[PDB]
Amino acid sequence: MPVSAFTVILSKAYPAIGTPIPFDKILYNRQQHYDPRTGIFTCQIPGIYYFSYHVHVKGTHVWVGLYKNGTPVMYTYDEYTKGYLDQASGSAIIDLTENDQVWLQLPNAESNGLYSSEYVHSSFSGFLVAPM
Amino acid sequence: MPVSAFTVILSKAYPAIGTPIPFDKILYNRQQHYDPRTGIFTCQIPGIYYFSYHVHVKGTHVWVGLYKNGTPVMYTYDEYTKGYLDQASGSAIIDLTENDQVWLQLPNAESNGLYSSEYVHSSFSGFLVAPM
Amino acid sequence: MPVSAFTVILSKAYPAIGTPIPFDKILYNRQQHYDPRTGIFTCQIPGIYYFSYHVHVKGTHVWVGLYKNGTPVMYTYDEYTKGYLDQASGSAIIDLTENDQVWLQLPNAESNGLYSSEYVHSSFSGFLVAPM
Ligand SMILES: [Ca+2]
Ligand SMILES: [Ca+2]
Ligand SMILES: [Ca+2]
Ligand SMILES: [Ca+2]
Ligand code: NA
């Protein structure tokens, strides 16, 4: 019965570093547990969730982390070969309680080549696997 | 109780563009909601589904889209560095109703380097997350 | 009611080939269905499971397979462009019965550039989609 899911896309490239990436294009976010203006997902239903993210790389390297309450729980890295775009993904099962927050963020200003556009979709998704 | 899931693999490289990619190798498709001869997934049970795809890149760039009823809902892109294969993935939560169709397709003839073989598996998967 | 999920990370790079990759860093493994010392996941609850893996490539090419009871069911490949790291992912729906085993393994010694570290996470995840 309990349901929570979302898939958001970034319409513009090179988000600011050291802060939640504000994916603004909504593909699905019916329960509104993800906030487009903050780029943060807030848990309302306790349980284990599955998160997945896909980023495109261009201009420079990309180092991105999946954060939980301000702490990085997973890092994904990919290097840019001059003149060629690349794509990198990551995913993880995370146990969440009410008010817990999850988001994506670029920790370092040097590896910030996160690319996205109307035709190249870097995205972020998540959904409740089992209520607990 | 309601169940719907599938994982299919492409046995040959470079599928035709502008049409559903016919993944022919079945890993799982018990409910038969995915059609190997059309490469189209048809919803029989309303609800939110999670789709995931993984493609290998070789020969030229790859631009692939996840389509819903003839309209692209997500694009994944990756460029081919001469002499080196690459791998790109994408995924999304999609709300579906009975008779809705979902598939993967290469929109452009110029970015059609979708590679696959008996030992390098480009795949397509999907499963019901929550009945509605 | 039935629940089974896990997400593990490899703390060191270049695991031994021809044997299960022993992901040692636990992100989630409450049901303990995955064994860190063997790198093998053993099914205790029959049903269809979804597995996902993400590897980073460095030094040489990477050819990795998702195995079920000693047989490869899916292969992912990615080539290393000298001086540039790459990232490759794969996923699949697998029907499992009690005592069935699933794991990741590098079949060939020539394509063993599987990289991982404290800041670059190659991971392996899986969870029960539907009990059967
Ligand atoms: Ca590339
Ligand atoms: Ca590559
Ligand atoms: Ca790269
Ligand atoms: Ca590359
Ligand atoms: Na990649």
Which amino acid is located at B39 in the chain? Answer: G
Domains and CATH numbers, chain C: 1-132 (2.60.120.40)
Q: What is the dihedral of CA C70, C75, C79, C80, to 10 degrees?
A: -50
Where is B29: in which H helix or E strand?
none
B109 CB burial (10 A radius; 0-12, 13-18, 19+)? exposed
SS3 content of chain B, % helix, strand, coil (to 5): 0, 60, 40
End-to-end CA distance of chain C: 12
Contacts of B11 (CB under 8 A, 6+ apart): B24, B25, B116, B117, B118
Query: How far is ligand 3, taken at its centre, from the CA of residue B93, in Å?
Result: 26
Which amino acid is located at B64 in the chain? Answer: V
Q: How many CA atoms lie within 13 A of B100 on its CB side?
A: 15
A64 Cα distance to chain centroid: 9
Q: How was this structure determined?
A: X-ray
C-alpha angle A42-A47-A53 in degrees, rounded to nearest 5: 55
Query: How far is ligand 4, taken at its centre, from the CA of residue C20, in Å?
Result: 26
Nearest to C127 by CA among C7, C4, C31, C1: C4
DSSP C89: E
Chains linked to B by 3 or more Cβ pairs within 8 Å: A, C
Query: With contact defined as beta carbons under 8 Å apart, do C34 and C126 qualify?
Result: yes
Q: How many CA atoms lie within 13 A of C132 on its CB side?
A: 16
Where is C106: in which H helix or E strand?
none
Distance between CA atoms of residues C123 and C119, nearest Å = 12
* Residue B59 φ then ψ, to 5°: 95, -50
Resolution to one decimal, Å: 2.0
Distance between CA atoms of residues A6 and A127, nearest Å = 6
Q: What is the dihedral of CA B17, B52, A103, C58, to 10 degrees?
A: -80
C-alpha angle B58-B60-B62 in degrees, rounded to nearest 5: 85
Nearest CA-CA distance, residue B27 and chain C, Å: 8
* Residue A56 φ then ψ, to 5°: -105, 145
**Hey, which bits of B5-46 come out as E strands?**
5-9, 25-28, 34-35, 40-42
Distance between CA atoms of residues B26 and B128, nearest Å = 18
B52 Cα distance to chain centroid: 7
SS3 content of chain C, % helix, strand, coil (to 5): 0, 60, 40
Contacts of C14 (CB under 8 A, 6+ apart): C59, C112, C113, C114, C115
Query: With contact defined as beta carbons under 8 Å apart, do A4 and A44 qualify?
Result: yes
| B23, B99, B114, B132, C98 from B42: Cα distances, Å | 14, 6, 23, 16, 31
C97, two tokens: 């019965």
Distance between CA atoms of residues B58 and B12, nearest Å = 13
Q: How many CA atoms lie within 13 A of B50 on its CB side?
A: 22
Which amino acid is located at A104 in the chain? Answer: L
Distance between CA atoms of residues A79 and B110, nearest Å = 25
C117, two tokens: 């570290």
Which among C7, C28, C86 is the nearest to A78, CB-wise? Answer: C86
CB contact under 8 A, B93 and A127: yes
